[PDB]
């Protein structure tokens, strides 16, 4: 992975040694080049994973997440450079440095072979993320959002640290390849119940599981755009990726320990989907949409079937691009009217025709129109949960109806109807904004032509 770690590190001297007026041009260009080289991780085999060294390996799960991570960095620089224009040069470079350091931690997190190494990098991503929200967030409540984000994570991740160290004492290793062969079944006992909870709760809080999700709508409403993009696109998936790995060593206890969390997710997705119908803040609505989509991923991971694991992987990639798009679309309205209230600016299709097309395409992927990878992932999960229990189709089906209602409600309210009379500063869409939208949707829709590369190891 050094071929990706080192050029990612080199982005920092590049940004600090650039001409004052070329920091965005240089950092954007070269992080796109890094993104290009990340397609070499597609050398995946039918049986064995791509095992680079003692520290890092890649397989069909981490590879799509790695490519999404490295693609998002140039998109985040594009999205941020406008609202940061007044910021002084040194603080602009510090912002870019936090984004670069976040990518470095993420690519190491997704390829770490040893689980304790994964833990440290999994935890390291908090620091830059918290700095981005609290330092460059706009409103007073970013400080509270920083605290809720920090302490929800640590409340769960500290027990995970104890469990992981305990496993290494008992098994002798935390290398994931070793655990694949030395895994022993988890017997029933109260000690093992709490070992299971310690191994899972940290990832649940990040997903987030319904009931532990209240930190996420806060974080989004306060974060700058780049913070929201990385939060929705990648940082939520640290939980899913972690769960997909650690469930290896929790069998067969997961058979019954998953029940409370399947109930929370199955009922949670309908609650959060219903909540979206009444949200008044556009960022908050998109945030609640994420909780509903990720509730599907939790269920898929917990029932552990080949179809559910393939659907979970596709959903994680598909949601990453869609939710990042939706935040970017909402932000482009914010940069004009400086309010997140959904009902403030209406009938924008009359004033911004092409931006309304991006709004339509994003909404259609959010409601999972076939054959988008959003639908492929959701469908594979629905198929597998039907076998788990036929009654789940009723809950899955109801959520599909509610998802369409709130996705189109968001499109109708902001883009259709009559424009607001007094809002007279809706200037035409910039080339930057249009390019940013298309750099989300185009790879998303292109993936429909070759979905296998985002279906994960079980493919």
């Amino acid at each position: 992975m050094l071929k990706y770690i080192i050029p990612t590190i080199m982005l920092m001297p590049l940004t600090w040694l650039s001409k004052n007026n070329m920091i965005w041009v240089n950092s954007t260009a070269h992080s796109l080049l890094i993104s290009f080289t990340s397609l070499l991780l597609m050398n995946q085999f039918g049986d064995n994973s791509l095992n680079f060294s003692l520290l890092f390996f890649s397989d069909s799960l981490s590879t799509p997440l790695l490519i999404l991570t490295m693609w998002l960095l140039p998109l985040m620089l594009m999205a941020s450079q406008h609202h940061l224009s007044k910021e002084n040069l040194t603080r602009k470079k510090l912002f870019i440095t936090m984004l670069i350091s976040l990518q470095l931690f993420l690519i190491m997190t997704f390829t770490a072979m040893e689980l304790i190494l994964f833990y440290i990098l999994f935890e390291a991503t908090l620091v830059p993320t918290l700095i981005i929200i609290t330092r460059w967030g706009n409103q007073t409540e970013r400080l509270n959002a920083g605290l809720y984000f920090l302490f929800y994570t640590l409340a769960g991740s500290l027990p995970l640290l104890v469990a992981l160290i305990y496993i290494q004492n008992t098994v002798g290793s935390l290398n994931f390849l070793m655990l694949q062969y030395w895994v022993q079944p988890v017997h029933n006992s109260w000690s093992n119940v709490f070992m299971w909870l310690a191994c899972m709760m940290a990832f649940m809080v990040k997903m987030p599981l319904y009931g532990l999700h209240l930190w996420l709508p806060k974080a989004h409403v306060e974060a700058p755009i780049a913070g929201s993009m990385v939060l929705a696109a990648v940082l939520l998936k640290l939980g899913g990726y972690g769960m997909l790995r650690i469930t290896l060593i929790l069998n067969p206890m997961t058979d019954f320990m998953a029940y409370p969390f399947i109930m929370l997710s199955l009922w949670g997705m309908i609650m959060t989907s219903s909540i979206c119908l009444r949200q008044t803040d556009l960022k908050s609505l998109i945030a609640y949409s994420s909780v509903s989509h990720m509730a599907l991923v939790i269920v898929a991971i917990l029932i552990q079937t080949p179809w559910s694991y393939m659907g979970a992987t596709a959903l994680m990639i598909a949601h990453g691009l869609t939710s990042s798009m939706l935040f970017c679309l909402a932000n482009s309205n914010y940069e004009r009217i400086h309010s997140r209230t959904m009902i403030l600016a209406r009938g924008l299709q009359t004033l911004l025709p092409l931006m309304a097309t991006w709004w339509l395409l994003a909404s259609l992927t959010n409601l999972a129109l076939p054959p988008t990878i959003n639908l492929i992932g959701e469908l594979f999960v629905v198929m597998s949960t039907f076998s788990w229990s036929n009654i789940t189709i009723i809950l899955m089906g109801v959520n599909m109806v509610i998802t369409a209602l709130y996705s189109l409600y968001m499109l109708i309210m902001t883009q259709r109807g009559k424009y607001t009379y007094h809002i007279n500063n809706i200037s035409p869409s910039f080339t930057r904004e249009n390019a940013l939208m298309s750099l989300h949707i185009l790879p998303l829709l292109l993936l429909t032509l070759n979905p296998k590369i985002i279906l994960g190891p079980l493919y």
Partner: protein
């Protein structure tokens, strides 16, 4: 050029990273041509099966 010398930092980081990844392989050759699946005889001019 003093204008465009910063543009080699990341490309050279990739070349250095690529090179160090190959160096890493030289330390993991304990089973080169020794696995039951792929073990074979060397070709007349072959020194090693892979590097």
């Amino acid at each position: 050029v003093r204008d465009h010398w910063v543009h080699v930092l990341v490309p050279m980081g990739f070349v250095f990273g690529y090179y160090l990844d190959r160096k890493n392989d030289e330390k993991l050759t304990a089973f080169r041509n020794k696995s039951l699946l792929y073990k074979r005889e060397l070709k007349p001019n072959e020194e090693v099966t892979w590097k």
